[PDB]
Amino acid sequence: NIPSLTSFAEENNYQYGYTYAQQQLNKQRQDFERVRLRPEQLSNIIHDESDTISFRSNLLKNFISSNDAFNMLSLTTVPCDRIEKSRLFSEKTIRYLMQKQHEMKT
């Protein structure tokens, strides 16, 4: 097949109305461009991450994540002088930067 560019012309094709070579080329045209342009009627209809995203699950997760983070704010009756600060380094990041600074003189 792989019919033509002349078979795609408007003269050899039907229009809103109101030969043999044309009716032979339009067989191969409709038999080529209906196995090429047909959509996939099976799975892999996900196509990406941002099509199977769920508004209901994210809305439920945000309803939980706002409620518990607001219960963290108001109901935690620890005064501001008593809120102890967290460490800016870990127990492993403080070992690796003692190791690499020891090995930095090479």
């Binding site: 792989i2 560019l5 080529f32 090429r36």
Partner: protein, 49 residues
């Protein structure tokens, strides 16, 4: 899609090639037709004399 792409690239090259063929074809006709008509007119005024 790949085969029709390759056919789309095939068709442009064929079309470009044909013109310079038919430029040689059409000039072959008319200049020979000129050379025919010159070979006609070589004898035309000859017999008048």
């Amino acid at each position: 899609d790949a085969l029709l792409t390759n056919q789309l690239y095939k068709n442009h090259e064929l079309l470009k090639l044909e013109r310079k063929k038919t430029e040689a074809v059409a000039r072959l006709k008319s200049m020979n037709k000129s050379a025919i008509n010159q070979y006609n007119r070589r004898q035309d005024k000859k017999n008048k004399r």
